[PDB]
Design a protein around this nucleic acid. Structure first.
Ligand SMILES: [Mg+2]
Ligand SMILES: [Zn+2]
Ligand SMILES: [Zn+2]
Lengths: 151, 48, 49, 102, 48, 515, 49
DNA sequence: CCGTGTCTAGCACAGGGAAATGTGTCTGCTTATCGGTAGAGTG
DNA sequence: CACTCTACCGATAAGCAGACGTACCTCTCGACCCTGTGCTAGACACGG
RNA sequence: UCUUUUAUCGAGAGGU
């Protein structure tokens, strides 16, 4: 059961860190490279994990036991704000950071608004969707010229 | 943090030279003409 | 019509000339206001009175 | 990059074709598959990139149920689910699929 | 030329302060020289 | 060649069978290629350009710039001419289609033989670079204060390097102790990247001269100056608690901002590389030479304590010998350095992306040449001298429009200089005509209103220097007998003549007349 | 505008209250105003442009 | 050997969103130091 | 009935940050950037 | 029987 995996005081700490918008995945990557490269050396990077949630723009979270390891993980990283802005997360806040998810809507016969092309902004009825599940056939009031000025 | 951002917008809607924090820029990088500045100054309203 | 010329036409005393220079010969406007609240928020319509 | 639906690991797609999944390929056999099979067991759509450096002592890894896997990049959420025929085959192998799509 | 370039604007701003300070002192119909709200400045204008 | 090469690197662990491959990506840059201006038609053809059509069709007048590249791969398990942009050309300079030809063809080319050149052409217009002006660098100035201040005398210096002719850091020394006010008459300095006024004995002993005979030996040049020696006492009585090197090194290392937790071990190394680099960079940046800097600081404190006790007048801030004009050379260089750094870093980023997919970056496509072209054309086109995204806080009014009207109001425009002191604060010291302006600038001609005395117009027989290297002079000196520094000793050298070269103090001699 | 109308007449910058005075009109050709020279003392004016 | 179809790459257009670190005088108002008591716990 | 030992309000500076630069009039010369997605064109491979 | 259009922000060069 997932309820037996809840964090305790014995688990490492998690710090949040502010990073350049859009560079959160890059920072997570860079931290992994540094960790793996230093494994088994006399100066290992003493972090356990790092991650970035899309819903939380401009932040990376880093798992460790000492704050100094956070500074070590980010040292020289050009995507991280130099101000000593890291913040501590409470144990009681940990699991919510890792919640995976109900918009998943769209039904045949319903209305949607088109987001691209000459029909951008127009209301359309959903007629049907592709077998694979990607594109939907829409019923639309046309915007035509009957070839009037074609060459 | 987002609520603090809303406070920041409501703040820079009526004052641009808030001593204490950077001026909210335009799209093209120029300081916004907050309402506080249409009035004061030699070339505002009550002088102009 | 700078502030200093205003000060001079105050020094002469011609109040009507000033009331003119700063109204008719520039930008006159009319506003319908209430008498209880005291704001320029009156919704008016004229040809229907 | 694609994410394995079984273990959540994130790798360049061709890796799933070249070497299989490093955590799962004993049962998934992606190494010896076609692209249709790889694309049914791995997803191009995933969210929440996680660097796991120390699987076995990370609480983050334990929560995501990747604590017995190899250090690497993992995804918090992987969209899609394993095809019912593959789930059935995994179950024949004593493997229980817990979907990672939320 | 430098001194001439300096002092004139100084004197102008000084005059603006003076005029904006003294611009509501009238001579009412009995000799009093009251301001805008009755503070008798001079009881009889010019003392004579 | 300020930044010769670029270097990437790749360590290992790339989904393999435990096999490292240390791979570096290195790029080198040798050789410039400058071609005469050329028009690239919209049809696609190209042909030579001349300034007449450059003016008529509202065109720019620039030259392509080619730069060579070269790559190399480092490993260990355990191309050709790239067009980097165009540069506007000044009329009648060697790299122009008008330095030759002579008259008859000048007439056929629709150009007047009375025009003298000297102006740029941007977007079918004629631009001029107002000779800008700055203050001289790498000398020693000693100014004073007004009196409601706890500081009575200040020594100041701006340090700038030579290859590049650009400024780096600012260093100061402040003398406290108002005349019988402020209690202690102590001396406190200021460093780059620090927080508090660090005393002086602490920087002496911090550089490695812990005794006192060496310090009072460096500062004063006589053993009878018991007046300066009388003022020195509180400096040593202030620097008594520190007696050796390391505790002063870390005494400085703890203040210098940095992080917070670089204790003794790493923080001493922090303060050390601080006291090699930023502090007095125009002297040197190689180790085993800190004696030189100690001698220099000795001279500086000496001059300060010569100005404080009133044996020599305070420096005048407007003596025209202490000023340097920035013409068309020292301006175009800085902007191009900035833009070139930007191009370099963009190439860096594109290389990062095209190597993650494990491909070859074509170099022909890894260069967006519009950076330098649009930057130069913008800065010369508008005048806001600097960049674009930083509109404010950047200097304005350096490139103006030529004043074509009469033939005097043009020669009187290709000779003008401008001092950026401002318009506020009135004051009548930077506006007056100084005594040292005899024959170097004009006394009468000047605008009126806000800028009287600021805008200048050079005399009829003036000239601006170019810039010669100093190593030959050093050879001509060390021929006849310039004694090196390290052999110095002030009690041994109490009658020597101290030879300066470009400000940095390099040696001493004895008999000066023959030299 | 015809003969003998009273027009106000002003120069910037006006200081004392004599820099704004009403003159009588007199139509003349050419393109410039005209003043009797005796009124060049309150205006601080001269005909040098 | 030629033609057609599919896939990949490049260019153009549209939509969304910021940053590597790099002038001088006055007055009033908001914070630390100083005293000074001015009391009461004390021998 | 000398004594301290602390809770008061003075009176200090004390440091600080910001608020403020004559009047009117004429003329000439300039304009968002970056990233992502979609569409079109070209090249290569396969089939007839 | 009328009517009838002059962006915007900023920078600089000028005249009393
Ligand atoms: Mg005149
Ligand atoms: Zn009402
Ligand atoms: Zn897997």
């Amino acid at each position: 059961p997932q309820r037996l995996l809840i964090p305790t005081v014995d688990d490492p700490g998690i710090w949040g860190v502010k990073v350049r918008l859009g560079k959160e995945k890059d920072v997570v990557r860079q931290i992994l490279k540094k960790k793996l490269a230093r494994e088994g050396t006399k100066n290992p990077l003493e972090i356990y994990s790092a991650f970035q949630r899309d819903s939380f723009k401009g932040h990376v979270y880093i798992e460790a036991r000492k704050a100094e390891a956070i500074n070590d993980a980010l040292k020289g990283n050009v995507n991280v704000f130099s101000n000593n802005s890291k913040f501590l997360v409470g144990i009681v806040e940990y699991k919510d950071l890792l919640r995976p998810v109900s918009d998943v809507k769209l039904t045949r016969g319903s209305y949607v608004r088109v987001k691209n092309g000459k029909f951008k902004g127009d209301l359309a009825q959903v007629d049907e969707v592709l077998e694979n599940g990607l594109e939907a056939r829409l019923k639309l009031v046309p915007r035509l010229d009957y070839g009037k000025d074609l060459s | 943090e987002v609520e603090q951002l809303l406070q920041f917008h409501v703040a820079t809607y009526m004052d641009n030279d808030i001593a204490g924090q950077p001026q909210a820029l335009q799209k093209s990088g120029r300081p916004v003409k907050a309402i506080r500045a249409r009035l004061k100054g030699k070339e505002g309203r009550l002088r102009g | 019509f700078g502030e200093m010329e205003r000060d001079c036409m105050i020094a002469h005393g011609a109040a009507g000339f000033l009331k003119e220079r700063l109204m008719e010969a520039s930008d006159a406007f009319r506003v319908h206001v209430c008498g209880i609240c005291g704001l320029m928020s009156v919704i008016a319509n004229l040809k229907k009175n | 990059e694609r994410a394995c639906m079984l273990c959540g690991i994130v790798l360049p797609g061709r890796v799933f074709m070249q070497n299989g999944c490093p955590n799962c390929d004993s049962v998934l056999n992606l190494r010896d598959s076609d692209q249709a099979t790889v694309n049914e067991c791995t997803s191009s759509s995933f969210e929440g990139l996680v660097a796991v450096g120390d699987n076995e002592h990370s609480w983050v890894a334990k929560w995501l149920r990747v604590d017995r896997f190899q250090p690497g990049l993992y995804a918090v959420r992987v969209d899609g689910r394993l095809p019912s025929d593959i789930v059935a085959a995994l179950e024949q192998y004593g493997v229980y699929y817990r979907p990672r799509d939320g | 030329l430098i001194d001439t370039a300096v002092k004139t604007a100084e004197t102008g701003y000084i005059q603006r302060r003076l005029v904006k300070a003294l611009e509501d002192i009238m001579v009412h119909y009995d000799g009093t020289t009251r301001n805008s709200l009755g503070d008798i400045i001079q009881f009889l204008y010019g003392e004579d | 060649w300020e930044e010769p090469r670029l270097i990437l690197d790749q360590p290992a662990q790339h989904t393999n069978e435990k096999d490292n491959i240390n791979k570096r990506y290195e790029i080198r840059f040798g050789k410039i290629y400058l071609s005469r201006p050329t028009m690239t038609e919209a049809d696609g053809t190209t042909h030579a350009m001349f300034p007449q059509e450059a003016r008529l069709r509202n065109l720019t007048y620039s030259s392509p710039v080619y730069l060579d590249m070269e790559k190399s791969m480092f490993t260990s398990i355990d191309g050709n001419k790239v067009h980097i942009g165009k540069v506007p050309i000044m009329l009648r300079s060697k790299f122009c289609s008008l330095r030759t030809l002579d008259e008859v063809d000048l007439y056929k080319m629709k150009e007047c033989p009375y025009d003298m050149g000297g102006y740029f052409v941007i977007n079918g217009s004629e631009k001029v670079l107002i000779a800008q002006e700055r203050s001289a660098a790498n000398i020693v100035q000693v100014f004073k204060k007004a009196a409601p201040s706890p500081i009575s005398h200040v020594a100041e210096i701006r340090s700038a390097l030579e290859k590049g002719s650009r400024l780096i850091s600012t260093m100061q020394i402040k003398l406290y102790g108002r005349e019988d006010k402020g209690t202690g008459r102590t001396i406190k300095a200021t460093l780059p990247y620090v927080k508090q006024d660090i005393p002086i004995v602490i920087v002496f002993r911090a550089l490695g001269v812990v005794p006192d005979g060496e310090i009072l030996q460096h500062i004063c040049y006589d053993e009878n100056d018991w007046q300066m020696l009388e003022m020195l006492k509180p400096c040593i009585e202030e620097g008594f608690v520190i007696q050796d090197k390391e505790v002063a090194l870390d005494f400085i290392g703890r203040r210098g901002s940095a992080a917070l937790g670089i204790r003794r071990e790493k923080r001493i190394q922090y303060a050390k590389d601080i006291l090699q680099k930023e502090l007095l960079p125009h002297i040197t940046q190689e180790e085993g030479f800190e004696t030189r800097k100690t001698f220099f600081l000795g001279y500086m404190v000496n001059r300060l304590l010569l100005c404080a006790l009133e044996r020599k007048d305070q420096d005048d801030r407007d003596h025209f010998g202490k000023k340097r004009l920035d013409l068309a050379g020292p301006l175009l260089a800085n902007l191009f350095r900035i833009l070139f750094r930007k191009l370099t870093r963009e190439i860096y980023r594109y290389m990062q992306r095209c190597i993650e997919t494990d491909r070859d970056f074509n170099l022909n496509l890894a260069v967006k040449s519009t950076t330098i072209t649009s930057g130069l054309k913008y800065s010369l086109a508008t005048g806001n001298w600097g960049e674009q995204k930083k509109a404010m806080s950047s200097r304005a009014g350096v490139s103006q429009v030529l004043n074509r009207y009469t033939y005097s109001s043009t020669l009187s425009h290709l000779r003008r200089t401008n001092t950026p002191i401002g318009r506020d604060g009135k004051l009548a010291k930077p506006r007056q005509l100084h005594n040292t302006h005899w024959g170097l600038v004009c006394p009468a001609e000047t605008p009126e209103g806000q800028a009287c005395g600021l805008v200048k117009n050079l005399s009829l027989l003036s000239g601006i220097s170019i810039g010669s290297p100093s190593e030959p002079i050093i050879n001509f000196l060390e021929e006849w007998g310039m004694e090196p520094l390290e052999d110095y000793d002030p009690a041994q050298h109490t009658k020597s003549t101290r030879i300066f070269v470009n400000g940095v103090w390099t040696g001493i001699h004895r008999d000066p007349s023959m030299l | 505008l015809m003969d003998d109308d009273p027009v106000l007449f002003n120069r910037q910058p006006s200081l004392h209250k004599m820099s704004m005075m009403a003159h009588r009109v007199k139509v003349m050709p050419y393109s410039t105003f005209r003043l009797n020279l005796s009124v060049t003392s309150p205006y601080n004016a001269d005909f040098d442009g």
